[PDB]
Amino acid sequence: SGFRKMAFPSGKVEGCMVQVTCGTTTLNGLWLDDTVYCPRHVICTAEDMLNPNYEDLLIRKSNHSFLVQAGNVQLRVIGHSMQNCLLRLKVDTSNPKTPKYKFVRIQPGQTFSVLACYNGSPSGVYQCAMRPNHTIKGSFLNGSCGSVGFNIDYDCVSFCYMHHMELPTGVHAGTDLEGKFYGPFVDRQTAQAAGTDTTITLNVLAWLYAAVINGDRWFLNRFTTTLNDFNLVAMKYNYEPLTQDHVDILGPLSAQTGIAVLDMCAALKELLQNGMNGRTILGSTILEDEFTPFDVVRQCSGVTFQ
Amino acid sequence: SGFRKMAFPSGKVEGCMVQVTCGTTTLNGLWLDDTVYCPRHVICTAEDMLNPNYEDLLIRKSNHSFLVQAGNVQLRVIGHSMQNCLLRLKVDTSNPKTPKYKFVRIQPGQTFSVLACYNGSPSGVYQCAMRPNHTIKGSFLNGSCGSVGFNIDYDCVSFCYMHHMELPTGVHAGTDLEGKFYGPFVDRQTAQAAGTDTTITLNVLAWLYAAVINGDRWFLNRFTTTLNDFNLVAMKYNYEPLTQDHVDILGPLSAQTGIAVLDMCAALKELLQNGMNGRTILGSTILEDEFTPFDVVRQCSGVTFQ
Ligand SMILES: O=C(Cn1nnc2ccccc21)N(Cc1ccsc1)c1ccc(-c2c[nH]cn2)cc1
Ligand SMILES: O=C(Cn1nnc2ccccc21)N(Cc1ccsc1)c1ccc(-c2c[nH]cn2)cc1
């Protein structure tokens, strides 16, 4: 029993973290096989960030412009190239701790584990949702750039995020491991700001299913809803509209609990209109939206507490 | 910026997890040097748990009654002994991944990272407070017994918890790594129940300091309090009484923010009496008590956002 925001075990990723220095600028890199991946802003001074031309900054560097430190060991850079907003450094040594891995671009609403790192040294691990506005509500200080986000399936690490930026509202922006930003953000000084955000409806429904699996039904009701009538209420409360694709994804949790998805939508409508009347769900006073349907099936018993 | 419930990176602990089987009973062990530590209830059938005599159950076992599996490798047991509520198995092989480590008994209100494990395989990591009632609000399923809790300081792992039991309210109980239970709990079937709990006042104050370091002052006020007048309010709201030792511990956070501890106590009194008036602190609608003063200094900037 219980329900916690649970990260994946971080060891497979810890063994891949290194420090990358270019001049007076240091941040973290990800060392897989004979490549080190890091934010291309490592080649900038703080002042270059005002209007950088990365092509023009990079052509002025050699392989020996870059220092890579793996624990106590100096790795020698033997090649370099820019891929979107990442630098790829070729090094003379293959990481012997390289796990089975993939690069994946995650979709808004999906979750991942962040390994916060400073100077190539892992400091902490926590779980993040990718917000609909393509930010994450992380916890990052100066030097955290190049920290990565990931999921693990059967000893395969799926890397999905590299940390580049904190926006003026204190939320975080970054790229996939091809160097493409999540969202409309850029690695230079602009008036860019986190867009309007919405509550991840699919995740709230998954988490209500988690609460029933763990034995709690107080918030259910005798009503049903159509998808359209649910969405009129969703719009009022700044929830993402529910789609038939979302209903289909909730099939397995609906079958484990015997609560039809649109009956669980009617329960959520009543919680949005009436509030929680001083009650908790899975120990929360608010509706939680940072657990996916996958997260719930991963963490909860396969046997409902009926 | 940001503030998250952050666990320590789990790799150093992952390399120590194994599976221990005695007959038809399997759970997790911790492999350090040539010793495997696990809950002594591995020697019981489900029925033995009703009234076990562990001394009488153990003397009926040999070294070869125990199977230890480290990944794909069978470790041979060459000795065994009971220490309080743990079994210590001597094995023929020293764990080459043994980190620098200590065993520590943590105090109520202190935090630690849990590596949830099944069949010797790590599944997830999350941060726990030890409640004043000596339980943890974990997330554990059948097979999780022998999962451990830990803190890391400068590459030294301080192990502080081994998982034994879920209580009837769904909260969790276990031992230190000498096999002494936290709290009055026993590894047999009784009417034992989680005692009355209280909110960890020191941790709430630390987290209000975190909110000021991160740039938010909305909840401060022009008032001060004595320790006695604060404690009359604490008693009404089921908070732990504040002591002078707690005031002293908050010295560094008080100095970083320039808010006297008893002035921050007056802010908390007003939040307890008036509520949060629809506002959030560090994104929370409630007062958070699972971050210690140490946790706040570890995670927050050393520079207040003034
Ligand atoms: O946001 C960042 C870097 N960053 N990321 N996470 C952080 C958390 C706390 C503080 C700073 C953080 N910027 C701001 C910026 C400016 C234009 S685009 C983005 C940032 C600041 C300095 C540098 C830099 C490059 N070279 C030396 N310093 C790069 C990014
Ligand atoms: O609570 C446990 C074991 N346990 N720990 N975390 C859990 C989470 C979900 C389900 C069970 C969990 N017990 C109950 C108990 C009974 C007397 S004392 C404690 C438990 C159940 C069975 C066994 C057992 C021993 N041998 C075979 N099964 C041991 C503990």
Curated annotation (Swiss-Prot), chains A, B:
Catalytic reaction equation(s): TSAVLQ-|-SGFRK-NH2 and SGVTFQ-|-GKFKK the two peptides corresponding to the two self-cleavage sites of the SARS 3C-like proteinase are the two most reactive peptide substrates. The enzyme exhibits a strong preference for substrates containing Gln at P1 position and Leu at P2 position
Peptidase C30 domain sequence ranges: 1-306
Subcellular location as annotated: Host cytoplasm; Host Golgi apparatus
Variant or mutagenesis effect after changing Q189P: In strain: Isolate BJ02
Residue intervals annotated with topology Cytoplasmic: 1-306
Active site (catalytic residues): H41, C145
Superkingdom as given in the UniProt entry: Viruses
Subunit relationships: Exists as monomer and homodimer. Only the homodimer shows catalytic activity.
Function: Cleaves the C-terminus of replicase polyprotein at 11 sites. Recognizes substrates containing the core sequence [ILMVF]-Q-|-[SGACN]. Also able to bind an ADP-ribose-1''-phosphate (ADRP). May cleave host ATP6V1G1 thereby modifying host vacuoles intracellular pH.
Protein name as annotated: 3C-like proteinase nsp5
Residues of the full protein shown: 3241 to 3546 of 4382
